[PDB]
Design a protein around this nucleic acid. Structure first.
Lengths: 127, 391, 332, 225, 35, 166, 110, 91
RNA sequence: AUGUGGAACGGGGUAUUGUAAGCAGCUGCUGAGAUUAAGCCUUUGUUCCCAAGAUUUG
RNA sequence: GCGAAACCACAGCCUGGGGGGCCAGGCAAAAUCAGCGGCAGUCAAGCGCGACGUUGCUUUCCUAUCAUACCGAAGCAGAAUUCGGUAAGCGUGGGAACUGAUGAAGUGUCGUCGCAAUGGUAAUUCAACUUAGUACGAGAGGAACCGUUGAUUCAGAUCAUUGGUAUUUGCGGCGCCGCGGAGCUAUCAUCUGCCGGAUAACGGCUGAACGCCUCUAAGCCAGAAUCCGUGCCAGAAAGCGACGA
């Protein structure tokens, strides 16, 4: 169930949730193997840690769980049809898996939809 | 202690055996005579430095696993003090870290001594000195570990307390038949015999009453078992369940139990009691009934009747105070290997066309995109239209 | 350089994939074959439903990357017989059939068109004079044999190639008695034993070959294992490529011919993944060694739709038929 | 009343859907969950285990009522053909094209009225009025357009978000013309519609559903009888 | 998991190969041997 | 887990069907198991097992004797006590207290060194007051001034274990 | 599989090859060709690209319409004979499409 | 709680055992050559095995004792299992 | 070292670009033109070629 | 085509032992080319001390496993944890001519076919579904087997789908730009990676020494990520066979 891995750590992605944050500096990737000559990355559907760069001051300088929604990288789907979204956007979640934003804005991958059901109900325009 | 999850306390020499074995396994056990003097100094030094760290590892593991008796609840700490001489246990804990601090200083003294190593055999004597002298410190603390393991056996045997939630304390005559009602109430059932102090240990039994958890808290009948029952009843947000043998089938007089109830009336204060007249089917009671807060219930312990009604009254008083498809899949191919067939699960007319496959697309066009219900009549009109267009 | 099982890295000897091991069989089984010979047409892709319970796409539609292999009907021309010795496995008698084509007679020769073409002349004479001499050697086969293998060479005329020498291979017959195998061999001499009687479209193949020379990496023989057959097509039938879900008749040969191969007219096997060697290198099929119980083989296979676009370039059409109605009328 | 989990978690309302006339069970899961609905209402209504767009989000992606069930645009026609085979002729099947595919997570439907998102398309609202034949109300459930996510709907009751105002709850209950319960499912979770399933004759709750919350749901939906 | 020479992954497989694939293979080569 | 709330419950639940036959056979097998455990064992772990075995043999022999009786650069690299100071003595190497064991009392008690009476190595060592075995050192005897001879080599040992000269 | 269309080249979209990109407005555009993918990247008009069908469409160079044979978000029940006639309906429709477009090509060339 | 299934096959040679602590593992206990085992009918949960060669008979039941051998659990609480009590002659 | 043989072209398919020159009043010719094996395919089309010298070994 | 020079006891295989040569071994076929604990005291085994005891303070290799496999023991219900054992195979505590490519020659010569002495090896861990909210457990927690599906690393191949190069000096536009086939490239893309015995600890059965007993003494079973064979890689260029003329 793997996707394309091209989003390395220490990157700025859009906090597309309704939590009020705008930008987030990527921090960590969960469950990533020790791979040399290739940074530990994630795609739309992986739980990651990031520190909010822009947005609320309480959210800023505070790392929390997050999952990628919009995939700027060519996420080669299992259906074969590749998809190139606008940019790299995501939504912050709790360590248990509760999305911080009460609403969702932007696109979220269907491959990411089945993994996280808490963030699935927060979105209505799943595309 | 309730959530102890502490490691067992082994023999000190056995603890020293594995620790020395850790020095025999983790440290480099070979030291060449041709190596550098400082390198040889660190061979016995860093091993001893790890040995003291190993000595500090299990000791701090024992220290962290040792809980604070003052941090325990008033009913938990007093019963623990009544269990295995917690004052002497804390003194051993006081003798544990201080000796560990003494072990820390002796190792630091030897480390500074090892910093000025001169000869190989002198360091070899020094390497023997710091290990064995600290082993003598382990040998000095001989009986300290003996009391911890039994306490570790006691704390593991000691269950969790449910004072914060709604609970029910059952105290009175020893095995007066209300314990049988208590055994019929909760999932955990305590065994009783005709002997005295049979229900010496408290029973942690989970139960619910009227959509509210009712914890049956067992207390020994009134020593050591009753003193623990006194300490548990001292600090508890629960009600009393005084079972009085009306027919003296519990071996105790009603006047002796009521006077004891009058004696235990200070501990029974600030709580709605239950004057369970046990052994109904088997004067001084009016003086006990003068309190008013005791729920006088006639309990036929011989006939085993009246427990649920008392459970309904006391809990309210406590509330007043407060084949299948999977079966088909089990026979077809098991879980994760059997496939479900949806051809039979169809409302189509022709069953032969139901199990048959359906052409999704043809000639570069989606066959379903141009498929309508009246397409057969439309195609017949299409064949006539093309014939008319040709004519 | 960590897979020392494949070190040392030196090039292979035989351009044709040499079979080393042969599957364990019984005398209770009926007589059947193990090996075969095919050619590397090229890689393609398909779509197919997935009747695999317990997977994340159970009863879904998933692309699969595949490989069509050009497989002609296969000409058996005789047998060899092995006796078992403390020194290994020696071959006792080699008995051929009476007649050979020029293609397999090109195999024995280096310059067939220059030379006198006189191979197998006098052996055909003793075939006509005395078949009881052949009986004598066959009498020595059913008396003293343990492993029977039959000869074989490819119908390379049907394959559109400039190579005219046939490729000769053994196939070990498996099943039945030793006398049954010689009975099966002498009743199939000089004919062709076709591919559709070997496999059942649900069996897996461990295809072998020599990998692609890289202009000393490459040209090193491999035995790739565990590739699944999806369709043993019939070259005479024009419905080979067209599945039941895309009834409209179409051919497996893509437009503009295959890249580096060209056109395909004969039976093919539709094996997934890949195999060693470049396009139109000789290729070998064989049976599995252990009866493998993965559900990837125990499942049925029923295709959905095949892509036959122009691999030369980047085509966007299935057949030149449907292209013209999708396009307008050209200036032609 | 049923208290179980959709294999993975207790949020069973997101995995599978259920209408008043048929039940849309998902595919790819274990047969126990399908047998759970089969033993519950299989003898009454149909329960078809089928995937929606090759995914397991049938509960929150499509909306359905006693009249019919409408699904997103990207639904597979073969799945629709499977749906048209599984669902009866009286069960209307119609695909809806919109920029928001989650009909179940953003729109709530009942046997008499419907709760629609304030940002829903007019053609989508008219088609929903044509198919489901219920009084659609394009509004925001507790300020959220995800009406199906923030609230649950049933025939003999309704479940509203606990964060909504009581005056707004009384306004929404009057708009729905049915009793609404401003509570939470799965013992205080944020999933209301996906945290509890309720039909006209049965109801389903999660494995993590509270005993009091389930009792609040059965009283609101009149499921005690 | 298990290893190459792991009997745990091989003892259950021999019982798993008694049913499943073996009879289907016998059903496969029967029609293959048919002319 | 054990005797409290398990054992009596196990009494009502029963034990293993062969809980006694397994122990006795293992008990009888131990009489022959100790020989191979003494024979096939090798290395330091065997000597450790032999250390307890030699202790057990000694422990049993004493018990057998009792039962029979019952039946009847210019630097100072050595430890010091604290131009003329040509060498260098470290602060950590300097020792001020010593475990002084009285000859008559036998009380090994840590006491401070009042001074260094005489070092048997060299007068310069006596001038430097280095710590060594057999040296005469002044020690305060008020809490017991007295002299003492070092009975242990504090260089290789690291501690000044000295016996009172009186 | 319902085949999509090229967003720029206006041709059909088949399985395997190509790419399907979605916009921020939930507008999924599928380009069947890499040049068409580059055309959508370069944002050139489909009717202003001679190599695209929209240019011939909005210039009179392509056939406008052909309502031959007198012929879907609603699912319906399946029938063997209904689909059989639907299978035969596409053959005559394609034949009429070949004849009508040829006459349209005869008018366009003249 | 979970009764252990036992099925005698091949004249009692192939012992099909299952449901040991409700486990789905198919326990096949092939008897030694020359010994016949059968489920005793007088006493429930009793298997009577008889034969001429006692060594092959005794090792087979010990193998049966090693077949459903308990592991990865406390032997005290988990106490029900397969045991051998009667060992005697056929006459 | 004479064949459904080969070489050089031509034809066709296939694709890459992008509607050719030029004509008339941006449009129609013009989804045209060009290119496509040099490690694309095909060829009943045209022309040409072929009856081989030397060496090694029995 | 012209054409040195340095240098030159004679030289050229490895292991061990007293270096190239010696001793004992492994072996050994031409001819060439490209990379390269102490002190004090009390005892007392025994021969004045005296043991165990008692009293005073202070790249690769190697297992000695850091996880994975398997078990043993423990207040080990379960989970989780501790100790011990096998175990260095693979992962995550220490040590430090070689590989390619031609090549004559016994087999009368050439060619096809397999044979196999030997040389190397391979897979790896992680988690998801039931099987379970079950057994168990007051509750809270929560088994294990089989079956199934995944993910990571490594290895092996593969260039349809996606990407990069233009000496296709190929197509077009204004030396510049758009495209750029093929070929090439890629966890940038894609497919595959297995099994049969024998064993360590350990658990056993039978059964003497020693009339009992005893997993042992002769036998015997089960039993490890363990080893050896299957399979996989190559084929002695002085190993060999059948057939073709």
């Amino acid at each position: 169930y793997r996707m394309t891995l091209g989003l390395p750590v220490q990157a700025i992605m859009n906090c597309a949730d309704n939590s009020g944050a705008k930008n987030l500096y990527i921090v960590s990737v969960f469950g990533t193997g020790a791979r040399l000559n290739r940074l530990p990355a994630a795609s739309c559907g992986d739980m990651v840690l990031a520190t909010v760069k822009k947005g609320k001051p309480d959210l800023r300088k505070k790392i929390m769980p997050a999952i990628v929604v919009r995939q700027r990288k060519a996420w080669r789907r299992k259906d074969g049809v590749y998809l190139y979204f606008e940019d790299n956007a995501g939504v912050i979640v709790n360590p248990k898996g509760e999305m911080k934003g009460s609403a969702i804005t932007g696109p979220v991958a269907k491959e990411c939809a089945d993994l996280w059901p808490r963030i699935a109900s927060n979105a209505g325009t799943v595309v | 202690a309730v959530f102890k999850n502490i490691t067992p306390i082994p023999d000190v020499n056995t603890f020293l055996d594995v620790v020395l074995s850790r020095t025999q396994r983790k440290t480099p056990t070979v030291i060449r005579s041709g190596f550098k003097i400082s390198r040889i100094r660190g061979f016995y030094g860093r091993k001893v430095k790890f040995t003291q760290d190993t000595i500090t590892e299990k000791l701090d593991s024992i220290l962290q696993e040792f809980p604070k008796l003052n941090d325990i609840h008033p009913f938990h700490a007093d019963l623990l003090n009544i269990l295995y001489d917690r004052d002497h246990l804390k003194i051993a804990l006081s003798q544990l870290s201080t000796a560990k601090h003494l072990v820390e200083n002796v190792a630091r003294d030897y480390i500074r001594l090892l910093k000025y190593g001169d000869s190989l055999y002198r360091c070899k004597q020094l390497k023997r000195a710091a290990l064995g002298r600290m082993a003598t410190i382990i040998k000095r603390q001989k009986s300290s570990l003996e009391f911890l393991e039994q306490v570790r056996q006691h704390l593991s045997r000691l269950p969790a307390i449910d004072p914060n939630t709604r609970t029910l304390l059952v105290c009175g005559y020893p095995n007066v038949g209300k314990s049988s009602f208590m055994n019929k109430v909760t999932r955990a059932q305590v065994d009783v015999q005709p002997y005295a102090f049979t229900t010496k240990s408290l029973f942690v039994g989970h139960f619910d009453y009227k959509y509210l958890r009712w914890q049956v808290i067992d207390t020994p009948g009134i020593n050591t078992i009753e003193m623990q029952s006194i300490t548990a009843m001292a600090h508890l947000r629960s009600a009393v369940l005084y079972f009085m043998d009306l027919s003296e089938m519990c071996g105790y007089s009603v006047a002796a139990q009521v006077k004891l109830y009058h004696s235990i009336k200070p501990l029974f204060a600030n709580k709605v009691t239950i004057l369970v007249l046990n052994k109904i089917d088997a004067e001084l009671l009016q003086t006990i009934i003068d309190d008013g807060n005791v729920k006088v219930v006639q309990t036929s312990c011989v006939q085993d009747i009246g427990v649920m009604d008392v459970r309904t009254t006391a809990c309210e008083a406590l509330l007043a105070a407060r084949i299948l498809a999977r079966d088909i899949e089990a026979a077809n191919g098991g879980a994760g290997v059997y496939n479900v067939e949806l051809r039979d699960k169809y409302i189509l007319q022709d069953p032969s066309w139901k199990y048959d496959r359906m052409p999704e697309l043809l000639d570069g066009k989606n066959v379903a995109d141009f498929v309508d219900p009246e397409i057969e009549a439309k195609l017949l009109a299409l064949d006539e239209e093309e014939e008319r267009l040709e004519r | 350089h960590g897979s020392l099982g494949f070190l040392p890295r030196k090039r292979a000897s035989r351009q044709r994939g040499k079979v080393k091991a042969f599957p364990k069989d019984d005398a209770s089984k009926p007589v059947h074959l193990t090996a075969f010979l095919g050619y590397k047409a090229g890689m393609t892709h398909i779509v197919r439903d997935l009747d695999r319970p317990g997977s994340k796409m159970h009863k879904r539609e998933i692309l699969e990357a595949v490989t069509v292999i050009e497989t002609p009907p296969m000409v058996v021309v005789g047998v060899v017989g092995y006796v078992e010795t403390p020194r290994g496995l020696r071959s006792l008698t080699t008995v051929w059939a009476e007649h050979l084509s020029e293609e397999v007679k090109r195999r024995f020769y280096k310059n067939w068109f220059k030379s006198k073409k006189k191979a197998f002349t006098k052996y055909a004479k003793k075939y006509a004079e005395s078949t009881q001499s052949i009986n004598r050697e066959l009498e020595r086969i059913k008396k003293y044999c343990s492993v029977v293998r039959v000869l074989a060479h490819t119908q390379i005329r049907k394959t559109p190639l400039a190579q005219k020498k046939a490729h000769l291979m053994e196939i070990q017959v498996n099943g039945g008695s030793v006398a049954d195998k010689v009975e099966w061999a002498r009743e199939h001499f000089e004919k062709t034993v076709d591919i559709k009687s070997t496999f059942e479209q649900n069996e897996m193949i461990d295809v072998i070959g020599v990998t692609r020379g890289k202009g000393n990496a490459g040209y090193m023989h491999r035995t790739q294992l565990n590739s699944k057959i999806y369709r043993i097509g019939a070259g005479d039938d024009a419905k080979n490529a067209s599945t039941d879900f895309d009834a409209t008749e179409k051919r497996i040969t893509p437009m503009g011919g295959f890249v580096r191969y060209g056109v395909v007219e004969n039976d093919f096997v539709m094996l997934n993944g890949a195999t060693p060697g470049p396009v139109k290198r000789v290729l070998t099929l064989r049976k599995s060694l252990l009866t493998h119980t993965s559900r990837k083989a125990l499942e049925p296979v029923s295709l959905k739709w095949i892509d036959t676009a122009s691999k030369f370039g980047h085509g966007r059409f299935q057949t030149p038929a449907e292209a013209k109605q999708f396009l307008g009328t050209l200036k032609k | 009343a049923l208290r179980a989990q959709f294999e993975n978690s207790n949020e069973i309302g997101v995995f599978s859907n259920l209408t008043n006339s048929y039940a849309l069970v998902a595919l790819g899961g274990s047969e126990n969950f399908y047998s759970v609905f089969e033993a519950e209402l299989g003898d009454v209504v149909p329960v078809v285990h089928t995937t929606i767009g090759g995914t397991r989000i049938i509960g929150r992606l499509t909306c359905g009522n006693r009249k019919g069930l409408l699904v997103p645009s990207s639904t597979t026609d073969n799945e629709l053909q499977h749906l048209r085979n599984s669902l009866p002729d009286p069960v209307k099947i119609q695909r809806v094209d919109e920029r928001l595919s989650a009909l179940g997570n953003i729109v709530a439907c009942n046997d008499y009225v419907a709760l629609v998102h304030p940002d829903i398309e007019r053609e989508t609202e008219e088609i929903i009025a044509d198919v489901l034949d219920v009084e659609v109300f394009r509004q925001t459930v507790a300020g959220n357009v995800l009406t199906g996510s923030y609230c649950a709907l049933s025939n003999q009751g309704a479940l509203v978000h606990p964060r909504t105002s009581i005056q707004e709850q009384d306004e929404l209950s009057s708009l729905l013309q049915v009793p609404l319960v401003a509570g939470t499912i799965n013992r205080g979770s944020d999933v209301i519609g996906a945290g509890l399933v309720v039909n006209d004759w049965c109801a389903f709750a999660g494995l993590d559903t509270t005993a009091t919350e389930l009792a609040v749901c059965e009283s609101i939906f009149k499921l005690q009888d | 998991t298990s290893g190459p020479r792991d009997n745990n992954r091989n003892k259950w497989a021999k019982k798993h190969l008694k049913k499943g694939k073996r009879a289907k293979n016998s059903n496969f080569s029967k029609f293959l041997k048919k002319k | 887990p054990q005797n409290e709330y398990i054992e009596e419950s196990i009494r009502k639940h029963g034990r293993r069907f062969d809980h006694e036959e397994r122990k006795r056979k293992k008990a009888a097998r131990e009489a022959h198991d100790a020989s191979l455990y003494a024979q096939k064992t090798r290395g330091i772990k065997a000597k450790l097992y032999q250390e307890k075995r030699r202790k057990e043999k000694i422990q049993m022999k004493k018990t057998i004797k009792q039962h029979e009786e019952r039946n009847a650069k210019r630097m100072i690299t050595k430890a010091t006590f604290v131009k003329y100071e040509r060498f260098i003595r470290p602060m950590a190497l300097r020792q001020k207290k010593a475990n002084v064991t009285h000859k008559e009392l036998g009380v090994t008690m840590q006491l401070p060194i009042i001074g260094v009476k005489k070092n048997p190595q060299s007068p310069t060592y006596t001038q430097l007051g280095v710590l060594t075995k057999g040296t005469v050192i002044e020690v305060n005897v008020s809490e017991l001034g007295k002299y003492a001879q070092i009975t242990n080599n504090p260089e290789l040992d690291g501690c000044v274990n000295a016996l009172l000269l009186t | 599989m319902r085949v999509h269309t090229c967003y720029f080249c206006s041709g059909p979209v088949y399985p395997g090859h190509g790419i399907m990109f979605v916009r921020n407005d939930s507008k999924v555009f599928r380009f069947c060709r890499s040049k068409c993918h580059k055309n959508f990247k370069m944002k050139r008009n489909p009717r202003k690209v001679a190599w695209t069908k929209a240019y011939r469409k909005a210039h009179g160079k392509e056939m406008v319409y052909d309502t031959a044979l007198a012929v879907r978000n609603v699912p319906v029940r399946y029938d063997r004979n209904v689909i059989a006639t639907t299978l035969n309906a596409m053959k005559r429709v394609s034949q009429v499409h070949a004849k009508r477009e040829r006459l349209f090509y005869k008018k366009r060339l003249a | 709680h979970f009764p252990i299934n036992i099925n005698l096959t091949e004249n009692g040679t192939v012992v099909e055992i299952r449901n040991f602590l409700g486990e789905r593992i198919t326990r096949v206990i092939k008897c030694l050559p020359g010994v016949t085992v059968s489920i005793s009918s007088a006493v429930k949960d009793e298997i009577i095995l008889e034969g001429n060669s006692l060594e092959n008979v005794s090792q087979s039941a010990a193998n049966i004792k090693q077949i459903c051998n308990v592991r990865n659990k406390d032997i005290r609480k988990f106490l029900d299992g397969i045991y051998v009590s009667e060992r005697g002659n056929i006459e």
